[PDB]
Design a protein that fits this description.
Chain C: It comes from Hepatitis C virus genotype 2a (isolate JFH-1). The complex is a heterotrimer, with one copy of chain A (166 residues) and two copies of chain B. With 166 residues, chain A is mainly alpha-helical. Helix content of chain A is 58%, strand content 0%. Helices cover 0% and strands 0% of the residues of chain B. Classes of the chains: A mainly alpha (166), B little secondary structure (9). The interface between A and B is medium-sized, with 22 and 8 residues. The structure holds zinc ion (ZN). Zinc ion is lined by residues 39, 43-44, 65, 115, 119-120 of chain A.
C-alpha cells in the first residue's frame, strides 16, 4: 500500500486526496452499515472508543454513538457534494481551504473506525467482516500517514493497531 | 463542532 | 478488551 497511496507521477495532490477521501468515506459508510443493527441508543449511550476515549457533542454535552456517527457521516457526504469544495467540473480549482476541510473529514472518519473497533469488534467478527475492516483501515491509515493528514492526538485510540499494521 | 476526544469521567 | 488489542494479534487481511 505504501506505493499505491503515493501521489501518482504528474498527479495533482488535491485531486489525489479528493478521490481517495471519497473512497474512504464509502468504505467506512459500508462498514458501519453492517453493524448499525448493533449500534443503538441502548448499546452506546455515549460516543466512545473504549474506556479511555470519549467524543463529546460539544465542549460538556454528550450524545449517543448512532446520533454522533449519523451526524458526522451526513456532514461528510454533504462536503463531498459541495461543488465549491469538491469541484467536479474541469477548470474549477479546489478552494484555498480544501486541505483543511479534507483533514477534518479524515479526522472524523477515523472516529467511526475507532468506535467500531472498540465497541463492535464482536459483531465484526461474527459477520466475518474482520479482514474487510482491517484492509480498509490499513489503506486509510497508510494514505493519511503518507501525507500526514491526521494529527497524532486524534490517532491515539488505535495507535496500538496502527503499529501492528505497519 | 465534534471536538477532539476527551478522557471520560 | 478486544482481540485486536492482544500483542500477538496478527491483523487478518483480505486475500
Ligand atoms: Zn456503537
Amino acid at each position: 500500500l505504501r506505493q499505491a497511496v503515493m501521489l501518482p507521477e504528474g498527479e495533482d495532490l488535491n485531486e489525489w486526496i479528493a478521490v481517495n477521501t471519497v473512497d474512504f468515506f464509502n468504505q467506512i459508510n459500508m462498514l458501519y452499515g453492517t453493524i448499525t443493527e448493533f449500534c443503538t441508543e441502548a448499546s452506546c449511550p455515549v460516543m466512545s472508543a473504549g474506556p479511555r476515549y470519549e467524543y463529546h457533542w460539544a465542549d460538556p454535552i454528550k450524545c449517543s454513538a448512532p446520533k454522533y456517527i449519523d451526524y458526522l457521516m451526513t456532514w461528510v457526504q454533504d462536503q463531498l457534494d459541495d461543488e465549491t469544495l469538491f469541484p467536479s467540473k474541469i477548470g474549477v480549482p479546489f478552494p484555498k481551504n480544501f486541505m483543511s476541510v479534507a483533514k477534518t473529514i479524515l479526522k472524523r472518519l477515523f472516529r467511526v473506525y475507532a468506535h467500531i473497533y472498540h465497541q463492535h469488534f464482536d459483531s465484526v467478527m461474527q459477520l466475518q467482516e474482520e479482514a474487510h475492516l482491517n484492509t480498509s483501515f490499513k489503506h486509510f491509515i497508510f494514505f493519511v500517514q503518507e501525507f500526514n493528514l491526521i494529527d497524532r492526538r486524534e490517532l491515539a485510540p488505535l495507535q496500538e493497531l496502527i503499529e501492528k499494521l505497519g | 463542532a465534534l471536538p477532539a476526544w476527551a478522557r471520560p469521567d
